[PDB]
């Protein structure tokens, strides 16, 4: 199956003289393997997966230097945007950057992306062709004009089609025994009464990797999403995930409802019915 | 790995 490597960056400014809080994480699929935190004592990029510790001091030094560079760039951009918006120096503002690449089963590049945000709103993103920018507001349009002048799209395209894919392939090779594992969910159904005439059926999916799953309810074969409650997938804490879906059903009609679980680790989609 | 090029606004 396809694989993805993603990096997530966050820089939050502080009203006091303290430097902005910068934290970065790296993901291969849904597995974290690196972190950088400015409030950490070490002030170095730290391993978060067993398979990334095979890397060398050269790797860790390069990553730490690049993290510090990114932190200072975000520090500059926070001030630039604050000056643009004439915002008070006593406020706290956030810059978020996410970028990465996708590769296929053969390991060749599929797609790459890069998106920037300021205070939770879209600021500037790289188009699918990796050759243009989409601006969400006028400050973004200023940045877009400058970047179209100075080759930012080409630099990002080079990184994504090069180094991102190479790193993803190397990380997959080094940690296949965990990164190339599909864990099917352990599924069971629970019955929670509400009233004498009403009840709730809840379909569970526990301990599955990767996080992409589809829990759906059907009444006598007809898909219905009117009384369906679906929580967002949550991490179990050990690399696996959990999810559940609920339907409010009348009492005595439990046998009419079925739960369908589609996951890439399952050979064929399941069908659970309440006994 | 991490992109070593940073851009300004």
């Amino acid at each position, epitope marked *: 199956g396809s694989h993805s490597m993603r990096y997530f960056f966050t820089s939050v400014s502080r009203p006091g003289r303290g430097e902005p809080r910068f934290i970065a994480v790296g993901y291969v699929d849904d597995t974290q393997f690196v972190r950088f935190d400015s409030d950490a004592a070490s002030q170095k990029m730290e391993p978060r997966a067993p398979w990334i510790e095979q890397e060398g001091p050269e790797y860790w030094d*390069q990553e730490t230097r690049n993290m510090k560079a990114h932190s200072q*760039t975000d520090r*500059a951009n926070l*001030g*630039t945007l604050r000056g643009y918006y004439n915002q008070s120096e006593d406020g706290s503002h956030t810059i978020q950057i996410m970028y990465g690449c996708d590769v296929g089963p053969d390991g060749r590049f599929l797609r790459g992306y890069r998106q920037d945000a300021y205070d939770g709103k879209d600021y500037i993103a790289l188009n699918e062709d990796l050759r243009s920018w989409t601006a969400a507001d006028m400050a973004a349009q200023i940045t877009k004009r*400058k970047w179209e002048a100075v080759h*930012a799209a080409e*630099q990002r395209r080079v990184y994504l089609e090069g180094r991102c894919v*190479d790193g993803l392939r190397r990380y997959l090779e080094n940690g296949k025994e965990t990164l190339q594992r599909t864990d099917p969910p352990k599924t069971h159904m629970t019955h929670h009464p509400i009233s004498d005439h009403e009840a709730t059926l809840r379909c569970w999916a526990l301990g599955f990797y990767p996080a992409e799953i589809t829990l759906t309810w059907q009444r006598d074969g007809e898909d219905q999403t009117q009384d369906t409650e679906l929580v967002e997938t949550r991490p179990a804490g050990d690399g696996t995930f959990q999810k559940w879906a609920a339907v409010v059903v009348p009492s005595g009609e439990e046998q009419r409802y079925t739960c369908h679980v589609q996951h890439e680790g399952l050979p064929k989609p399941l069908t659970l019915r309440w006994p | 790995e991490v992109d*070593p090029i940073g851009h300004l606004y």
Partner: antibody
Amino acid sequence: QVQLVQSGAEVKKPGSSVKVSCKASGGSIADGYISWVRQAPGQGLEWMGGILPRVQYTNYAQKFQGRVTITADESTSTAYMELSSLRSEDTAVYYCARSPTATAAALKIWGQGTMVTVSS
Amino acid sequence: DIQMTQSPSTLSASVGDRVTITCRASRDIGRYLAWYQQKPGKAPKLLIYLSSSLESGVPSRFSGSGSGTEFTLTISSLQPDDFATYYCQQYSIANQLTFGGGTKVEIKR
């Protein structure tokens, strides 16, 4: 187009310090990353360090760590380079270069160079 | 630091020749290499960025290739204006720049 203009040639005695300016015309010194490169007479290029003037955050080569102070002034659009404890090996032409990025990259805009003769 | 090795240090060629200059890094720098041209008494002129992309105004005879540890600068048809010294620079780490030794291209007779 941004142009970088440097100060004139300096003749310095050993143990003194020289400060070399680099003024950006047609733009701001803060719209990019200013690098400092030196070239000994008849020798290759050597990267000293740089500064991100918008945050005043600087980097130096390990060889020049503890001797070079690179600072930038956005009010006057000048980036300075001070090298202390001068010796005869510091006789070189010093260049300021700009990159249109937050980090040092392919240096496109260069200054004309300043010749520092460290002789007694 | 990543040390860049240039070869040859000196190259003699005639007008109309194909000139190849090789730059080798001590470790994988990816595509983050820049080529420069410098003439006596003048500042370096950026020719190629990202190891293959020509700068605006650079003639099409210049061409760069290579990723990883081996790189190449090629001048397809050498012109009188192309006799100078060429430096390769790596910028694979955001705050670390290293130049090569330099290659001087002289007129053969």
